[PDB]
Design an enzyme around this catalytic site. Sequence first.
Site, short mmCIF file in Angstrom:
data_model
loop_
_atom_site.label_atom_id
_atom_site.label_comp_id
_atom_site.label_asym_id
_atom_site.label_seq_id
_atom_site.Cartn_x
_atom_site.Cartn_y
_atom_site.Cartn_z
N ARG A 55 1.03 -1.14 0.01
CA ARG A 55 0.02 0.03 -0.04
C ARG A 55 0.95 1.27 0.14
O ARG A 55 1.89 1.05 0.51
CB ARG A 55 -1.10 -0.03 0.96
N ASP A 56 0.15 2.33 -0.59
CA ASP A 56 1.05 3.78 -0.41
C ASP A 56 2.31 3.71 -1.73
O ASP A 56 3.37 3.90 -0.96
CB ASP A 56 1.26 4.34 0.76
N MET A 57 2.17 3.25 -2.70
CA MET A 57 3.24 3.53 -3.76
C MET A 57 2.97 4.79 -4.05
O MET A 57 2.15 5.46 -4.15
CB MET A 57 2.54 2.53 -4.99
N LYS A 58 4.62 5.35 -3.95
CA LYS A 58 5.03 6.81 -3.89
C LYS A 58 6.00 7.15 -4.81
O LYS A 58 6.78 6.22 -5.31
CB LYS A 58 4.97 6.95 -2.47
#
Lengths: 61, 61, 189, 47, 61, 68, 61
Positions: free
Chosen positions: C64-67
């Site tokens: 989760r939370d690819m940035k």
Amino acid sequence: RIMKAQALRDNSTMGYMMAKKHLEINPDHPIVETLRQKAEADKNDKAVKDLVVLLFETALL
Amino acid sequence: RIMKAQALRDNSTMGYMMAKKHLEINPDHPIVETLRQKAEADKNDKAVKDLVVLLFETALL
Amino acid sequence: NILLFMGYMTKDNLAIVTQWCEGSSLYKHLHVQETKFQMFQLIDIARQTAQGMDYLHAKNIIHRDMKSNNIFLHEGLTVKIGDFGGSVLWMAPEVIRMQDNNPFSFQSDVYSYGIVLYELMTGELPYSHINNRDQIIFMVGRGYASPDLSKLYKNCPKAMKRLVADCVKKVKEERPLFPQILSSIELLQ
Amino acid sequence: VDYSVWDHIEVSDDEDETHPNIDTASLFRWRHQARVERMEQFQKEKE
Amino acid sequence: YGEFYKSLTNDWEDHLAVKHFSVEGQLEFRALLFIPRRAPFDLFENKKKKNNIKLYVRRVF
Amino acid sequence: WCIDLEVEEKCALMEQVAHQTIVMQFILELAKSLKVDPRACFRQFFTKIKTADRQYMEGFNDELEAFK
Amino acid sequence: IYYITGESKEQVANSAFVERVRKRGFEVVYMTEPIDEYCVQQLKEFDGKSLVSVTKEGLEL
């Protein structure tokens, strides 16, 4: 230079292998002329002792 | 020093990994105190320009 | 008698443990420093990370939370996904809500890729001038917000800027397009 | 001579299946995490 | 050849140079040998030599 | 042993002392010149074509035979 | 954890970066091998404490 920079030096063996230096002086040069005239005027002069090392180091570089 | 000395690394792309040199001076030490007195009289004086390259070279070394 | 012929002519080593470049976060590269490359390189690092994401998703693997930070940029044309990475989160609204505790589905990462693709296209944070924390949390979670196209660069040609605009439209959608996105960006190069 | 018991093995920390566009050292810790969470949900199913 | 190199190598660029030849006798091999225009990023970093010449018999790898 | 019958000895057996002693004595000089054991450092180095085996061997064969 | 890397123990022990941390009773680690650079790139911290280079800008004491 290169051997000292290696990651996997094997440093003891290279510490033997490093070869020694010979110093060369220019007979015509004002410095050598002066240093000789100074060293002939007094062989044991602390000023020529302090000079010979300062001069020598510059030649390493 | 070590990366420059590698036999089989392409150093041309060093531009993003080479660091930049920040120079720091001792505010207490006589030479730097004298250099603010020398620089005070003339900001454009080459004699103080000539130190700040010689001292830089001596500090690099 | 035994003394002479000392020199012994030993072996020399050419095996190198090659250094790896500490990669920049895209934050480091874009805002935190503003290191510049030509736009074709920016599209190449989009392709390179899209291949990485494609090869990844084929294995049911979700972070989760690819940035833009957890990606690293290295020496050569070289961009590569990592895990090191209030704090600066980017999210699909399904993840924001309390509603379902495993919002694990691939579409979230695709839309989060769409956010980091707009970072690649804008070189500045999405929502950077628009909002403080209350508005950026609430309006996005309610599905009621978009980052501005004003910061998206017009040095991009129609092909990729329209595809990035479709990467905004994917907030409305459930489509796990990654191999087809990869085809699309690749062919548009 | 049946070898079918050996057909399928999972190995985190395998260098033969690292994707070139991913930081290799990140992928191992990340692939290990998935294994343990899958196992814990299956232990919960036994409860 | 030029489009074959790009197909075999996934390169953008056209080949730098080609050899193409056939060896007669009991060993009947044919071979293409292409030189890339620019050296690959990881030419020495790899654990082992990364697949540069591929061997075929009767056109199966 | 090459000292034992220097007045009378036959060439073949003393030429084998030349060979044994030159190879072993070179090794022992390297073992003083390095940390190594003469079993650990090893005769893989005897493959070398170099002029330092051929020219120097016969030069020392003459020196060590003639002086005693 | 304060550390410094260089060409030998005594060259590091005499180096101009080290005097204040010695005066203030801190402990400096000496890292005198080419391979230390490659492990120090990855060993960013130990036991929850960061490693700080004595030879970098922004050094906090």
